[PDB]
Amino acid sequence: NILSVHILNQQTGKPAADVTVTLEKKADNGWLQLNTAKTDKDGRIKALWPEQTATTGDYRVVFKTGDYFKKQNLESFFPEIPVEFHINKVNEHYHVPLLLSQYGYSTYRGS
Protein backbone atom coordinates (compact mmCIF):
# COMPACT_ATOMS: atom_id res chain seq x y z
CA ASN A 1 0.00 0.00 0.00
CA ILE A 2 1.44 3.30 -1.14
CA LEU A 3 0.29 5.63 1.72
CA SER A 4 0.87 5.56 5.49
CA VAL A 5 0.19 8.37 7.92
CA HIS A 6 0.68 8.74 11.64
CA ILE A 7 0.17 11.28 14.38
CA LEU A 8 2.49 11.89 17.31
CA ASN A 9 1.15 14.17 20.02
CA GLN A 10 4.15 16.36 20.95
CA GLN A 11 2.49 17.40 24.24
CA THR A 12 2.38 13.81 25.51
CA GLY A 13 5.16 12.22 23.44
CA LYS A 14 2.58 9.52 22.61
CA PRO A 15 0.53 8.63 19.52
CA ALA A 16 -2.79 10.32 18.79
CA ALA A 17 -5.16 7.36 18.59
CA ASP A 18 -8.61 7.17 16.95
CA VAL A 19 -8.17 10.32 14.83
CA THR A 20 -10.15 10.40 11.60
CA VAL A 21 -8.03 11.01 8.50
CA THR A 22 -9.41 11.51 4.97
CA LEU A 23 -7.64 11.09 1.63
CA GLU A 24 -8.68 13.04 -1.47
CA LYS A 25 -7.40 13.34 -5.04
CA LYS A 26 -7.23 16.70 -6.81
CA ALA A 27 -9.59 16.67 -9.78
CA ASP A 28 -10.10 19.23 -12.57
CA ASN A 29 -12.59 20.95 -10.27
CA GLY A 30 -12.35 20.56 -6.52
CA TRP A 31 -11.39 17.27 -4.93
CA LEU A 32 -12.63 13.66 -4.87
CA GLN A 33 -12.51 11.54 -1.70
CA LEU A 34 -10.64 8.25 -2.03
CA ASN A 35 -10.79 6.92 1.52
CA THR A 36 -11.29 7.60 5.19
CA ALA A 37 -9.97 5.76 8.25
CA LYS A 38 -8.95 6.32 11.87
CA THR A 39 -5.51 6.09 13.43
CA ASP A 40 -4.95 2.92 15.39
CA LYS A 41 -3.72 2.61 18.99
CA ASP A 42 -0.19 3.48 17.79
CA GLY A 43 -1.51 6.58 16.02
CA ARG A 44 -1.00 4.91 12.61
CA ILE A 45 -2.91 4.23 9.44
CA LYS A 46 -0.47 1.90 7.69
CA ALA A 47 -2.54 1.52 4.52
CA LEU A 48 -4.68 4.57 3.75
CA TRP A 49 -4.74 4.18 -0.04
CA PRO A 50 -7.91 2.47 -1.32
CA GLU A 51 -7.86 -0.66 -3.49
CA GLN A 52 -6.99 1.22 -6.68
CA THR A 53 -3.83 2.02 -8.66
CA ALA A 54 -2.63 5.61 -8.13
CA THR A 55 -1.99 8.24 -10.78
CA THR A 56 0.59 11.00 -10.63
CA GLY A 57 -0.84 14.26 -9.34
CA ASP A 58 -1.88 16.11 -6.23
CA TYR A 59 -3.56 14.64 -3.17
CA ARG A 60 -4.69 15.83 0.24
CA VAL A 61 -4.90 14.12 3.59
CA VAL A 62 -6.93 15.84 6.27
CA PHE A 63 -6.24 14.96 9.88
CA LYS A 64 -9.38 15.76 11.92
CA THR A 65 -7.40 17.09 14.89
CA GLY A 66 -9.95 19.61 16.10
CA ASP A 67 -12.23 16.74 17.12
CA TYR A 68 -9.35 14.86 18.77
CA PHE A 69 -8.54 17.82 21.05
CA LYS A 70 -12.26 18.59 21.59
CA LYS A 71 -12.66 15.08 23.06
CA GLN A 72 -9.86 15.92 25.55
CA ASN A 73 -11.74 19.20 26.35
CA LEU A 74 -8.86 21.11 24.76
CA GLU A 75 -8.92 23.99 22.30
CA SER A 76 -6.75 24.17 19.24
CA PHE A 77 -5.97 26.82 16.62
CA PHE A 78 -6.81 24.38 13.82
CA PRO A 79 -10.30 22.95 13.16
CA GLU A 80 -8.46 20.27 11.19
CA ILE A 81 -5.12 19.91 9.44
CA PRO A 82 -4.98 19.47 5.63
CA VAL A 83 -1.73 18.38 4.04
CA GLU A 84 -1.38 18.54 0.26
CA PHE A 85 1.24 16.41 -1.44
CA HIS A 86 2.35 15.28 -4.89
CA ILE A 87 2.77 11.72 -6.18
CA ASN A 88 5.12 11.54 -9.15
CA LYS A 89 6.02 7.82 -9.02
CA VAL A 90 2.84 5.78 -8.60
CA ASN A 91 4.24 2.62 -6.93
CA GLU A 92 6.55 4.36 -4.43
CA HIS A 93 5.74 4.38 -0.73
CA TYR A 94 4.49 7.69 0.67
CA HIS A 95 4.65 8.35 4.40
CA VAL A 96 3.13 11.56 5.81
CA PRO A 97 3.53 11.96 9.59
CA LEU A 98 2.01 14.74 11.64
CA LEU A 99 3.71 16.08 14.79
CA LEU A 100 0.84 17.71 16.65
CA SER A 101 0.34 20.36 19.28
CA GLN A 102 -2.72 22.49 20.07
CA TYR A 103 -1.30 25.64 18.43
CA GLY A 104 1.41 24.26 16.13
CA TYR A 105 2.32 21.29 13.96
CA SER A 106 4.96 19.86 11.66
CA THR A 107 4.60 17.54 8.72
CA TYR A 108 7.13 16.04 6.31
CA ARG A 109 7.74 13.23 3.86
CA GLY A 110 8.81 10.34 6.10
CA SER A 111 10.82 7.25 5.27
Provide the binding-site residues for Zn ion, judged by CB under 5 A: 4, 6, 44, 58, 79-80, 82, 84, 86, 93, 95
Choose among its own copies, Zn ion, none what residue 83 binds, the Cβ cut-off being 5 to 8 Å by kind. Answer: its own copies
Residue 45 is which amino acid?
Answer: I
Is 86 annotated for ligand binding?
no
* 3-state SS class at 66: helix
Strands 94-101 vs 3-9: parallel, antiparallel or unpaired: parallel
* 44 is annotated as contributing to ligand binding: yes
Give least dist CB 37 to its own copies, A. 18
Q: Is 105 in the site for its own copies (CB under 8 A)?
A: yes
Interface with its own copies includes 80 (CB under 8 A)? yes
Structure letter (DSSP) for residue 10 = T
Q: Is 23 left (phi over 0), alpha (psi -120 to 50) or beta?
A: beta
Among 4, 42, 46, 67, binds its own copies (CB under 8 A): 42
**Residue 6 annotated as binding site:** yes
**d(C-alpha 24, C-alpha 61), whole Å:** 6
Burial class of 66 by CB neighbour count within 10 A (0 to 12, 13 to 18, 19+): middle
Summarize the annotated binding site for substrate as residue ranges.
6, 44, 108
Q: Where does this chain bind its own copies (CB under 8 A)?
A: 6, 8-15, 42-43, 58, 60, 66, 76-86, 99, 101-111
